[PDB]
Amino acid sequence: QDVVLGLYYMTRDCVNAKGEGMVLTGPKEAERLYRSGLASLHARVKVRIT
Amino acid sequence: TEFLKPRLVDIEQVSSTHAKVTLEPLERGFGHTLGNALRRILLSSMPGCAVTEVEIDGVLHEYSTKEGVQEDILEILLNLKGLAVRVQGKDEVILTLNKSGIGPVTAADITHDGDVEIVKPQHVICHLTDENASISMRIKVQRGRGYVPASTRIHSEEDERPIGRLLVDACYSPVERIAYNVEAARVEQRTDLDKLVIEMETNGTIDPEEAIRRAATILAEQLEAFVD
Amino acid sequence: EFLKPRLVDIEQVSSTHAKVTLEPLERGFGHTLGNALRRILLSSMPGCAVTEVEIDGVLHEYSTKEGVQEDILEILLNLKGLAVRVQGKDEVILTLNKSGIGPVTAADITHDGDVEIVKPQHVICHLTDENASISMRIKVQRGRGYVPASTRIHSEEDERPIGRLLVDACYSPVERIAYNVEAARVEQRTDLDKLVIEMETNGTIDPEEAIRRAATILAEQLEAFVDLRD
Amino acid sequence: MLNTCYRILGLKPTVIFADQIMYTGFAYAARSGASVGIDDMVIPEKKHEII
Amino acid sequence: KPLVGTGMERAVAVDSGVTAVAKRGGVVQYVDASRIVIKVNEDEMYPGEAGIDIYNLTKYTRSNQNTCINQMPCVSLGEPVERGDVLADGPSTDLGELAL
Amino acid sequence: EIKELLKLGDLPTSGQIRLYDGRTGEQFERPVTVGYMYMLKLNHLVDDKM
Amino acid sequence: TPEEKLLRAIFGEKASDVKDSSLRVPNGVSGTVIDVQVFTRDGVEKDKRA
Amino acid sequence: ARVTVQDAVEKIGNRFDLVLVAARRARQMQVGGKDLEENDKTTVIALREIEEGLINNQILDVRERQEQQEQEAAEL
Amino acid sequence: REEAVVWDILDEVIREHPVLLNRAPTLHRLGIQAFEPVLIEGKAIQLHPLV
């Protein structure tokens, strides 16, 4: 009930947040970017995943 | 008055860029006040060197596409943004890359200078197809503190860039990922003790245990004018 | 080449309020030190508070002396908020005698040389008779945090008397600690902050002494990471 | 997501993944502060004319 | 107390038996932890050999569920008490209201 | 009429303040509610259940 | 029993002529003793405490 | 330590005899007939042998009938 | 008396010994499951959220 409202909030998307349209280099670069205070938790980015 | 210091500090080494330190037993509530002031120093204020801008002599825009390479221009910049380069003495050094042949352009094909020292030769920068033997650029490494996206300097860029001066995201700090986790532990009569469990990677240039050490120095020196 | 935060002027709003400032804080450090200290001040500041009272003719907390208008269980809840300083010693044994109609405050405690009662109008009980009387022998100790009376029952060491009422002790001089990192402008710099730690104590701990006593708790704990011993 | 992770990888990764999905849902749900006020439940503008 | 009541607390704490409500107006003469002594007015006092009212409180005793039930005085010396007032709080009462 | 009181104590009329986290020190996004609930204490004590 | 008797002669302990059935505080409950009542049937001598 | 016996059920594919093969073997450690241990009990050691392939219902029988040939020696 | 050693022997008896938790109106077979205990202090049986 509550761990599903955390997954939902994390994996939505706004239309104009901090750090929008930039390009990342993997999941270790996004978590290191959001916890640093730069990019919002749901901004439309482009990453590289294997 | 008389506090509790940690003993039985274990550190586990796996995949030398990686490392997972544990530590205990810290006082009640000293798990978060300690590990969180450390995570803020590794991510935001930690000296390092990384490329900042490139000069593709054959391309003049970040969205264009260069001949012979199987890849794009954007996915080229993703490669250089992760190039682990440690320079010894200076603060600005402008390396040049010029490759011929058929295949992937590894990292060792760059020129080498008197103090600059790459730390991965088999890092692929771009796959070069046949008939060309043609690729050229200028990579610009410089020192700094923390992490600085390419969006903020372009918003206020006074260092004029001619047409064809790409701006690559500069990540200076040597830590790639860092995240602690606090948990319970006892001292044979106290159930409310803490046990900080750090866990950190790095981009090759510095071992993890050497990053946690030189980070606590940056934080233990700010308090230089209070402690006695 | 970082800068060093230096303690600067200390505005004092009241006897219990205060504000400090740490002028040349580098960029991104206003929140690293700000919250690293506030978790140190609310947790581990040493102070002194009452630890066991013993009244003259009352056996247990659920009794009632004749002449006062409060239970012996309600005098202990008024003593537990007694702010007191002890200069050199560790534990003291105060004394309070009084007779006659009127409230009994903390100003009527037998003034020892070191023990300096700070809030001298703190009411304790009222005497509602002309020939009433109270005589109690409080005790004071030093510590940190909050240790209930049940814990100390394990370290009583043959607590012989049955007239020794025990009160729970909460030795901590701070009650709330805010902070605000705003913009500071040194003569020539682009990025610099200024921390403003607005702490509110119960008149016991000195402000300037309360922040140096924190950094020596933090810089002393970071001795482990400066050298990793495996 | 858990029903497919069971059929494809068995039971060892599905027990060690049903936890990490819980530590990530609990942690990033606190960062929401998803608190329900009274400006939340909104009365429609035309609840009166429709009645 | 409750900061948000319904005004039906002064009636559920007085119309029960826990509170020690005054029986005749007057003036408090001797408040104590276990006794109150109201000295009635003249117009409320009976003609021949009336005197004073004296309310005994019930300090720590035992309820049915083993909770404790004792009354505390909520008046002082000199405070004029009127008929229908409230002198002694009960268990779960404060100034006459019902705080649970 | 609840909104007319929150302008008397100089509070936010919407009823929701912006709390900060306790340990990390960072700010909860999307403001939170903070009020004063009269809380009872039922006598289903765990000392008599165990 | 036989072994209990050999264990006696080795240590000559006197026989117990009375069994102990005191009243004891229940398990895990601790607090002061605020009263005592002592009732005596009409015809037996009161002890020193009653 | 153990969290899942899914490895043990691979060797013995029933889960109703793995509970019977491991209770018989775990008795032997408990009563010191035998010592094939990382601060574990005797029921998590019996499952880390079946998991590794050194015990099953045949290796317990034949190791018991090799006891009689031992007992037959001292039986004289 | 709960001397300092019995807590050393009680922590060793509970090493790999699973206990069977079971709720009151057991409807289906998943009302009784086993769990490896871990000694906490207090008087309430904790319980994983997914369970």
Side-chain angles (χ1 to χ4, degrees):
Chain A
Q1 89 169 7
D2 185 11
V3 351
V4 48
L5 173 67
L7 268 353
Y8 184 81
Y9 175 81
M10 149 163 48
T11 182
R12 268 187 54 96
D13 57 335
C14 219
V15 75
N16 189 3
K18 287 174 293 183
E20 172 75 312
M22 72 196 319
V23 49
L24 273 29
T25 182
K28 286 189 273 64
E29 157 89 331
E31 162 190 16
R32 187 257 308 293
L33 193 60
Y34 153 73
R35 298 289 277 150
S36 165
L38 302 178
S40 186
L41 179 48
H42 32 39
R44 300 203 227 76
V45 212
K46 184 160 299 177
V47 315
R48 154 197 287 178
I49 20 221
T50 76
Chain B
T1 64
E2 320 91 15
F3 264 86
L4 207 173
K5 285 175 161 298
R7 240 315 95 181
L8 187 71
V9 38
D10 165 280
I11 157 173
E12 186 255 57
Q13 230 292 355
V14 288
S15 61
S16 66
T17 47
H18 195 90
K20 165 182 167 189
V21 172
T22 152
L23 174 50
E24 84 131 341
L26 297 160
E27 260 289 9
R28 176 204 207 185
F30 268 77
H32 301 272
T33 153
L34 252 204
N36 176 80
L38 278 177
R39 173 179 53 65
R40 290 190 57 102
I41 294 183
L42 313 187
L43 303 186
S44 70
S45 62
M46 173 79 72
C49 324
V51 325
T52 294
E53 59 188 18
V54 307
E55 172 203 25
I56 296 296
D57 44 329
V59 176
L60 304 182
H61 209 312
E62 61 175 345
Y63 86 102
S64 177
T65 30
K66 181 64 175 298
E67 277 288 6
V69 301
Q70 169 262 0
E71 320 174 13
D72 212 59
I73 283 292
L74 305 185
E75 193 178 359
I76 273 182
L77 302 181
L78 262 300
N79 299 118
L80 296 183
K81 172 196 296 191
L83 189 56
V85 48
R86 55 210 248 196
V87 55
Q88 318 292 166
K90 311 165 53 178
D91 293 358
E92 289 202 10
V93 43
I94 170 177
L95 291 314
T96 73
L97 172 54
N98 200 38
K99 173 61 168 52
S100 299
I102 304 89
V105 171
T106 204
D109 308 0
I110 319 186
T111 59
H112 269 279
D113 303 13
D115 294 338
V116 181
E117 172 180 14
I118 312 286
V119 285
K120 217 157 185 54
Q122 56 274 352
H123 183 245
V124 46
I125 282 184
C126 70
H127 293 245
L128 195 52
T129 75
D130 203 333
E131 181 266 359
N132 249 265
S134 81
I135 181 60
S136 233
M137 62 185 67
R138 252 63 161 274
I139 55 181
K140 185 172 182 181
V141 10
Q142 48 184 165
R143 308 186 66 265
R145 239 164 195 87
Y147 178 80
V148 174
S151 171
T152 68
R153 16 134 164 267
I154 179 65
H155 189 207
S156 315
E157 158 260 346
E158 286 187 17
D159 316 9
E160 167 184 328
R161 287 183 286 272
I163 296 305
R165 291 299 293 187
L166 319 182
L167 232 53
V168 74
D169 288 325
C171 49
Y172 295 93
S173 323
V175 300
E176 279 184 338
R177 178 228 176 190
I178 148 78
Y180 70 99
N181 177 22
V182 137
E183 35 193 329
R186 69 188 190 99
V187 69
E188 264 63 3
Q189 191 50 23
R190 300 210 238 165
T191 308
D192 49 9
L193 270 286
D194 283 358
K195 166 195 177 195
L196 184 67
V197 184
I198 313 270
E199 148 188 355
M200 175 184 40
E201 300 195 26
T202 15
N203 65 331
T205 124
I206 282 303
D207 348 314
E209 178 261 23
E210 182 70 38
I212 288 179
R213 165 179 301 98
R214 89 160 54 175
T217 271
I218 286 187
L219 175 56
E221 281 199 13
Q222 293 306 92
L223 317 179
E224 166 216 9
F226 304 145
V227 315
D228 193 71
Chain C
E1 194 245 5
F2 271 110
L3 296 192
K4 320 305 301 188
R6 297 193 60 264
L7 166 58
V8 80
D9 47 359
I10 293 180
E11 172 180 12
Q12 182 89 5
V13 174
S14 306
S15 187
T16 71
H17 214 83
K19 288 176 48 184
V20 313
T21 304
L22 297 72
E23 200 69 297
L25 266 176
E26 210 71 16
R27 169 106 306 185
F29 278 65
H31 311 267
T32 299
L33 294 184
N35 185 83
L37 295 190
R38 174 187 185 277
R39 305 192 90 256
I40 297 296
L41 292 186
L42 294 181
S43 305
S44 315
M45 298 298 274
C48 31
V50 183
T51 305
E52 55 179 320
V53 189
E54 181 181 27
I55 311 180
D56 45 51
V58 58
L59 299 165
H60 46 102
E61 332 194 23
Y62 318 101
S63 177
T64 166
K65 183 102 105 314
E66 174 165 1
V68 309
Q69 65 159 331
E70 294 154 344
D71 317 6
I72 303 311
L73 179 66
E74 215 284 327
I75 297 175
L76 301 197
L77 306 178
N78 277 325
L79 282 179
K80 190 201 302 182
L82 194 72
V84 59
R85 301 192 61 172
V86 285
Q87 205 187 66
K89 308 181 285 288
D90 157 89
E91 142 186 359
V92 204
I93 312 94
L94 304 171
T95 311
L96 182 152
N97 298 47
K98 191 165 188 299
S99 53
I101 302 181
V104 161
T105 123
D108 299 353
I109 286 193
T110 294
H111 181 249
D112 194 347
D114 303 336
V115 187
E116 167 191 347
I117 308 296
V118 45
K119 180 73 177 312
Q121 321 94 34
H122 183 86
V123 79
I124 286 189
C125 58
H126 305 67
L127 279 308
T128 174
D129 193 357
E130 250 298 349
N131 46 19
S133 176
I134 40 179
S135 298
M136 59 194 70
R137 287 172 54 211
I138 320 177
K139 190 167 79 177
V140 183
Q141 308 196 33
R142 299 190 73 90
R144 10 174 288 268
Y146 161 82
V147 289
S150 68
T151 277
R152 260 199 309 283
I153 295 290
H154 286 212
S155 290
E156 48 98 7
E157 235 285 20
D158 299 0
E159 185 185 30
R160 312 185 300 261
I162 83 175
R164 267 277 177 182
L165 299 67
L166 285 158
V167 317
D168 303 317
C170 20
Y171 337 100
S172 207
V174 297
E175 302 192 49
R176 104 176 146 80
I177 316 291
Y179 65 96
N180 279 329
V181 42
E182 54 200 27
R185 267 308 142 204
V186 85
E187 93 103 2
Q188 194 37 247
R189 270 298 298 194
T190 304
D191 53 326
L192 283 187
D193 289 353
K194 172 189 63 177
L195 196 70
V196 171
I197 312 187
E198 170 225 299
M199 88 184 63
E200 158 167 330
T201 75
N202 61 335
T204 302
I205 243 294
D206 207 19
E208 171 194 352
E209 148 75 329
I211 285 173
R212 292 195 222 271
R213 172 109 56 177
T216 76
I217 294 189
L218 178 57
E220 183 204 35
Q221 275 275 6
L222 293 177
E223 157 260 41
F225 301 90
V226 178
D227 36 313
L228 283 176
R229 212 83 58 83
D230 305 71
Chain D
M1 185 199 306
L2 275 181
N3 199 10
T4 73
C5 176
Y6 183 90
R7 316 263 167 246
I8 304 198
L9 280 75
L11 177 72
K12 272 74 59 186
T14 293
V15 152
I16 204 186
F17 169 52
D19 289 324
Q20 300 290 345
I21 242 186
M22 185 187 81
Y23 302 156
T24 292
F26 273 163
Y28 289 89
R31 310 290 285 284
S32 297
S35 200
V36 53
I38 211 58
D39 96 87
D40 294 334
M41 45 206 78
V42 185
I43 308 294
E45 352 284 313
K46 310 168 297 298
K47 178 183 163 297
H48 284 183
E49 253 47 29
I50 297 176
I51 288 168
Chain E
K1 67 176 180 303
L3 296 188
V4 188
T6 49
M8 240 283 289
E9 285 133 356
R10 285 210 177 269
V12 195
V14 171
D15 283 330
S16 182
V18 292
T19 302
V21 16
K23 207 149 298 188
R24 273 185 299 170
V27 169
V28 168
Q29 177 179 3
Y30 170 82
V31 175
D32 197 88
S34 172
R35 190 194 300 95
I36 294 190
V37 178
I38 311 300
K39 164 184 187 54
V40 314
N41 284 326
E42 287 193 347
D43 58 68
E44 305 188 1
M45 171 154 52
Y46 289 152
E49 185 103 351
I52 78 188
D53 286 313
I54 162 189
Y55 302 102
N56 284 339
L57 311 182
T58 92
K59 307 305 288 185
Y60 300 81
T61 190
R62 201 188 79 96
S63 96
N64 276 132
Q65 278 67 359
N66 296 351
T67 54
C68 144
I69 156 247
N70 77 320
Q71 320 182 30
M72 296 157 46
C74 67
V75 289
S76 303
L77 282 79
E79 196 162 3
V81 151
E82 272 303 339
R83 186 193 229 277
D85 214 66
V86 153
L87 316 184
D89 299 352
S92 295
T93 28
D94 179 74
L95 275 251
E97 289 170 301
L98 173 81
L100 303 155
Chain F
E1 294 150 296
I2 296 171
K3 309 294 190 57
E4 283 161 300
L5 272 167
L6 305 179
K7 304 171 190 171
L8 220 81
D10 287 349
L11 297 179
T13 287
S14 48
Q16 297 173 308
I17 315 192
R18 33 106 82 161
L19 295 170
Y20 289 101
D21 204 331
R23 313 166 299 192
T24 135
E26 279 304 335
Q27 152 180 0
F28 291 141
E29 318 155 2
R30 64 182 298 96
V32 203
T33 283
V34 278
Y36 273 86
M37 272 202 57
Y38 189 81
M39 285 250 132
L40 287 358
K41 168 192 182 185
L42 319 188
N43 71 334
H44 296 2
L45 309 192
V46 77
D47 307 23
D48 310 357
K49 309 296 193 175
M50 203 241 294
Chain G
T1 69
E3 275 71 355
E4 290 176 280
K5 163 138 287 294
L6 172 68
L7 192 73
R8 282 293 163 73
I10 282 187
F11 302 129
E13 192 187 28
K14 304 157 172 290
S16 212
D17 224 79
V18 57
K19 211 167 186 65
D20 148 57
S21 60
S22 318
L23 169 61
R24 298 199 180 85
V25 178
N27 240 276
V29 47
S30 61
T32 75
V33 175
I34 70 178
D35 221 11
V36 157
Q37 307 292 50
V38 184
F39 306 98
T40 319
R41 178 173 65 92
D42 199 321
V44 62
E45 77 279 9
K46 306 177 171 69
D47 35 350
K48 180 201 303 177
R49 170 68 184 271
Chain H
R2 203 116 318 287
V3 328
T4 58
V5 308
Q6 198 62 14
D7 297 81
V9 176
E10 304 187 352
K11 315 292 176 179
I12 319 179
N14 208 342
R15 202 135 116 295
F16 288 131
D17 56 3
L18 148 74
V19 173
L20 277 183
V21 169
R24 174 186 190 181
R25 165 59 187 188
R27 224 144 231 139
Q28 269 148 183
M29 350 264 255
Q30 177 131 103
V31 163
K34 335 291 180 327
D35 26 54
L36 311 76
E37 74 168 333
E38 270 190 304
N39 201 22
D40 267 347
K41 286 230 166 309
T42 33
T43 63
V44 191
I45 284 192
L47 288 173
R48 294 199 303 111
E49 310 182 1
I50 307 187
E51 180 235 37
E52 192 166 345
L54 305 89
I55 284 302
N56 52 87
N57 198 34
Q58 297 186 21
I59 308 296
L60 280 176
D61 286 354
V62 72
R63 191 53 165 85
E64 170 173 14
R65 294 180 297 96
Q66 292 181 8
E67 264 306 331
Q68 300 323 288
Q69 294 178 6
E70 301 301 336
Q71 291 188 2
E72 166 180 335
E75 253 289 14
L76 306 168
Chain I
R1 286 191 292 269
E2 284 110 344
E3 296 188 8
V5 212
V6 18
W7 301 117
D8 271 4
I9 297 302
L10 163 63
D11 144 66
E12 178 188 318
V13 172
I14 310 302
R15 192 66 163 81
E16 319 284 10
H17 211 279
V19 301
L20 265 31
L21 262 35
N22 150 64
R23 213 227 196 190
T26 306
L27 295 172
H28 55 308
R29 120 232 258 255
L30 296 183
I32 282 221
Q33 316 194 35
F35 287 113
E36 290 198 346
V38 42
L39 301 315
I40 70 167
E41 170 54 279
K43 300 174 139 176
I45 297 188
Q46 310 211 295
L47 210 67
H48 196 244
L50 296 197
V51 171

Short mmCIF file of all heavy atoms in Angstrom, two decimals, chain C residues 20 26 29 35 39 67 70 76 92 94 98 106 109 120-121 133 138 168 171 175 181 190 199 205 212 216 219 229:
data_model
loop_
_atom_site.label_atom_id
_atom_site.label_comp_id
_atom_site.label_asym_id
_atom_site.label_seq_id
_atom_site.Cartn_x
_atom_site.Cartn_y
_atom_site.Cartn_z
N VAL C 20 24.51 32.67 16.87
CA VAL C 20 25.92 32.70 16.51
C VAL C 20 26.02 32.90 15.01
O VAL C 20 25.02 33.02 14.31
CB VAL C 20 26.65 31.43 16.95
CG1 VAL C 20 26.30 31.08 18.37
CG2 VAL C 20 26.30 30.30 16.03
N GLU C 26 32.37 28.09 2.88
CA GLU C 26 32.47 27.85 1.45
C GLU C 26 31.12 27.42 0.89
O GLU C 26 30.16 27.19 1.63
CB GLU C 26 33.52 26.79 1.16
CG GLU C 26 34.20 26.97 -0.18
CD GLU C 26 35.14 28.15 -0.20
OE1 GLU C 26 35.50 28.65 0.89
OE2 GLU C 26 35.52 28.59 -1.30
N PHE C 29 28.76 24.08 1.99
CA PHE C 29 29.06 23.67 3.35
C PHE C 29 28.11 24.23 4.39
O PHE C 29 28.16 23.79 5.54
CB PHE C 29 30.49 24.09 3.74
CG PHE C 29 31.54 23.16 3.26
CD1 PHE C 29 31.78 22.98 1.92
CD2 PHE C 29 32.31 22.45 4.16
CE1 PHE C 29 32.75 22.13 1.48
CE2 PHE C 29 33.28 21.59 3.73
CZ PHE C 29 33.50 21.43 2.39
N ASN C 35 23.54 21.01 9.72
CA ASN C 35 22.82 19.88 10.27
C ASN C 35 23.74 18.90 10.97
O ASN C 35 23.27 18.12 11.81
CB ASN C 35 22.05 19.16 9.18
CG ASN C 35 21.20 18.05 9.73
OD1 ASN C 35 20.09 18.28 10.20
ND2 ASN C 35 21.73 16.84 9.71
N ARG C 39 22.42 17.98 14.98
CA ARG C 39 22.22 16.64 15.52
C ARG C 39 23.18 16.36 16.67
O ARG C 39 23.05 15.35 17.36
CB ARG C 39 22.40 15.58 14.45
CG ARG C 39 21.55 15.76 13.24
CD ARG C 39 21.58 14.52 12.38
NE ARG C 39 20.53 13.58 12.75
CZ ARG C 39 20.74 12.47 13.44
NH1 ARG C 39 21.96 12.18 13.83
NH2 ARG C 39 19.75 11.66 13.73
N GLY C 67 -0.62 20.68 54.67
CA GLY C 67 -0.18 22.06 54.72
C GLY C 67 0.12 22.64 53.35
O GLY C 67 -0.07 23.83 53.13
N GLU C 70 -0.50 20.36 47.16
CA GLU C 70 -0.09 19.54 46.03
C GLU C 70 0.37 18.19 46.55
O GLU C 70 0.89 18.10 47.66
CB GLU C 70 1.02 20.22 45.23
CG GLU C 70 0.58 21.49 44.54
CD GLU C 70 1.72 22.45 44.30
OE1 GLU C 70 2.78 22.26 44.93
OE2 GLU C 70 1.56 23.38 43.49
N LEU C 76 7.37 16.65 42.66
CA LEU C 76 8.46 16.09 41.88
C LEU C 76 8.37 16.49 40.41
O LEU C 76 9.39 16.60 39.73
CB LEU C 76 8.47 14.57 42.01
CG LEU C 76 8.63 14.05 43.43
CD1 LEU C 76 9.03 12.61 43.40
CD2 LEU C 76 9.65 14.87 44.15
N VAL C 92 25.86 17.59 43.92
CA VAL C 92 25.60 18.43 45.06
C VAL C 92 24.35 17.91 45.77
O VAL C 92 23.61 17.10 45.23
CB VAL C 92 25.43 19.91 44.67
CG1 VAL C 92 25.75 20.81 45.83
CG2 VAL C 92 26.29 20.23 43.48
N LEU C 94 21.42 19.98 47.51
CA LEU C 94 20.82 21.23 47.93
C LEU C 94 19.90 21.01 49.12
O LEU C 94 19.67 19.88 49.56
CB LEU C 94 20.06 21.87 46.78
CG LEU C 94 20.90 22.11 45.53
CD1 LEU C 94 20.03 22.53 44.38
CD2 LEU C 94 21.93 23.16 45.82
N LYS C 98 11.25 25.99 54.59
CA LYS C 98 10.39 27.16 54.59
C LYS C 98 9.13 26.87 55.38
O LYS C 98 8.70 25.72 55.48
CB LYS C 98 10.04 27.61 53.18
CG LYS C 98 9.37 28.96 53.13
CD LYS C 98 9.37 29.53 51.74
CE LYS C 98 8.86 30.96 51.73
NZ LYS C 98 7.47 31.06 52.22
N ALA C 106 12.18 28.71 43.85
CA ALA C 106 13.56 28.26 43.85
C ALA C 106 14.48 29.27 44.52
O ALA C 106 15.64 28.94 44.82
CB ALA C 106 14.04 27.98 42.43
N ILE C 109 16.10 28.25 48.18
CA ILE C 109 17.02 27.14 48.36
C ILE C 109 18.28 27.67 49.03
O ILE C 109 18.73 28.78 48.76
CB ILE C 109 17.34 26.45 47.02
CG1 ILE C 109 16.15 25.62 46.55
CG2 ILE C 109 18.54 25.56 47.15
CD1 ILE C 109 16.48 24.68 45.44
N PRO C 120 15.20 31.99 39.37
CA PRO C 120 14.91 32.04 40.81
C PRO C 120 13.45 32.25 41.17
O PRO C 120 13.13 32.27 42.36
CB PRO C 120 15.76 33.24 41.27
CG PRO C 120 15.83 34.11 40.08
CD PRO C 120 15.87 33.21 38.89
N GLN C 121 12.55 32.40 40.20
CA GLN C 121 11.12 32.51 40.50
C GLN C 121 10.36 31.25 40.13
O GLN C 121 9.12 31.28 40.10
CB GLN C 121 10.50 33.70 39.78
CG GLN C 121 11.38 34.93 39.73
CD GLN C 121 12.19 35.01 38.46
OE1 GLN C 121 11.73 34.60 37.40
NE2 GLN C 121 13.40 35.54 38.56
N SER C 133 5.31 23.49 57.07
CA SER C 133 6.75 23.43 56.91
C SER C 133 7.11 22.32 55.94
O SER C 133 6.48 21.26 55.94
CB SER C 133 7.44 23.20 58.25
OG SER C 133 8.84 23.07 58.08
N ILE C 138 17.39 17.88 48.03
CA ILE C 138 17.50 17.55 46.63
C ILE C 138 18.90 17.02 46.34
O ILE C 138 19.80 17.13 47.17
CB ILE C 138 17.18 18.78 45.76
CG1 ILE C 138 16.01 19.54 46.38
CG2 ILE C 138 16.79 18.36 44.38
CD1 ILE C 138 15.68 20.79 45.65
N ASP C 168 12.98 11.07 37.46
CA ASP C 168 13.65 10.89 36.20
C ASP C 168 14.44 12.15 35.84
O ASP C 168 13.99 13.27 36.07
CB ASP C 168 12.66 10.58 35.09
CG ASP C 168 11.83 9.36 35.40
OD1 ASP C 168 12.40 8.37 35.87
OD2 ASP C 168 10.60 9.40 35.18
N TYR C 171 19.15 15.57 31.63
CA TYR C 171 20.24 16.53 31.60
C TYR C 171 20.45 16.98 30.16
O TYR C 171 21.15 16.32 29.40
CB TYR C 171 21.53 15.93 32.15
CG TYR C 171 21.37 14.75 33.07
CD1 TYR C 171 21.56 13.46 32.61
CD2 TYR C 171 21.10 14.92 34.41
CE1 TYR C 171 21.44 12.39 33.44
CE2 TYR C 171 20.99 13.86 35.25
CZ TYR C 171 21.16 12.59 34.76
OH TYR C 171 21.05 11.52 35.61
N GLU C 175 16.81 23.13 23.95
CA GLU C 175 15.44 22.72 23.72
C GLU C 175 15.03 22.87 22.27
O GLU C 175 14.05 22.25 21.84
CB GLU C 175 14.50 23.52 24.61
CG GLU C 175 14.81 23.39 26.09
CD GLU C 175 13.70 23.94 26.95
OE1 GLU C 175 12.53 23.59 26.71
OE2 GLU C 175 14.00 24.73 27.87
N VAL C 181 21.27 29.33 6.44
CA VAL C 181 22.46 29.63 5.67
C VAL C 181 22.10 30.64 4.60
O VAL C 181 21.40 30.31 3.63
CB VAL C 181 23.06 28.36 5.05
CG1 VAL C 181 21.95 27.50 4.50
CG2 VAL C 181 24.02 28.73 3.95
N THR C 190 33.12 34.95 -5.11
CA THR C 190 31.86 34.76 -5.83
C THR C 190 30.90 33.87 -5.06
O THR C 190 29.68 34.08 -5.11
CB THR C 190 32.13 34.19 -7.22
OG1 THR C 190 33.03 35.05 -7.93
CG2 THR C 190 30.83 34.09 -8.01
N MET C 199 20.14 29.05 18.64
CA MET C 199 19.87 28.03 19.64
C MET C 199 19.17 28.66 20.84
O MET C 199 19.43 29.82 21.17
CB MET C 199 21.16 27.35 20.09
CG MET C 199 21.86 28.03 21.23
SD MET C 199 23.42 27.23 21.61
CE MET C 199 24.28 27.50 20.07
N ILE C 205 23.56 26.24 29.75
CA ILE C 205 24.76 26.14 28.94
C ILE C 205 25.05 27.48 28.29
O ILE C 205 24.15 28.16 27.79
CB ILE C 205 24.62 25.03 27.89
CG1 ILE C 205 25.65 23.92 28.12
CG2 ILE C 205 24.77 25.60 26.50
CD1 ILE C 205 27.07 24.35 27.91
N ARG C 212 31.68 25.10 20.66
CA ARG C 212 32.98 24.45 20.73
C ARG C 212 32.88 23.06 21.33
O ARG C 212 33.64 22.17 20.95
CB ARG C 212 33.96 25.28 21.54
CG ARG C 212 34.36 26.59 20.90
CD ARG C 212 35.59 27.15 21.58
NE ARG C 212 35.47 28.59 21.78
CZ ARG C 212 35.87 29.49 20.89
NH1 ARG C 212 36.40 29.11 19.75
NH2 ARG C 212 35.72 30.79 21.15
N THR C 216 34.23 19.58 19.08
CA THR C 216 35.17 18.61 19.64
C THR C 216 34.51 17.25 19.83
O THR C 216 35.18 16.28 20.18
CB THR C 216 35.74 19.10 20.97
OG1 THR C 216 34.76 18.95 21.99
CG2 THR C 216 36.13 20.55 20.86
N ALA C 219 34.80 16.51 15.47
CA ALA C 219 36.17 16.31 15.02
C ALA C 219 36.85 15.17 15.77
O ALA C 219 37.80 14.59 15.25
CB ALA C 219 36.97 17.59 15.18
N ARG C 229 41.99 1.38 9.77
CA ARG C 229 42.91 0.42 10.35
C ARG C 229 42.58 -1.02 9.99
O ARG C 229 43.26 -1.93 10.48
CB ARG C 229 42.92 0.57 11.88
CG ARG C 229 44.25 0.25 12.53
CD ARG C 229 45.19 1.44 12.48
NE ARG C 229 44.59 2.60 13.12
CZ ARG C 229 44.61 2.82 14.43
NH1 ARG C 229 45.22 1.96 15.24
NH2 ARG C 229 44.04 3.91 14.94
#
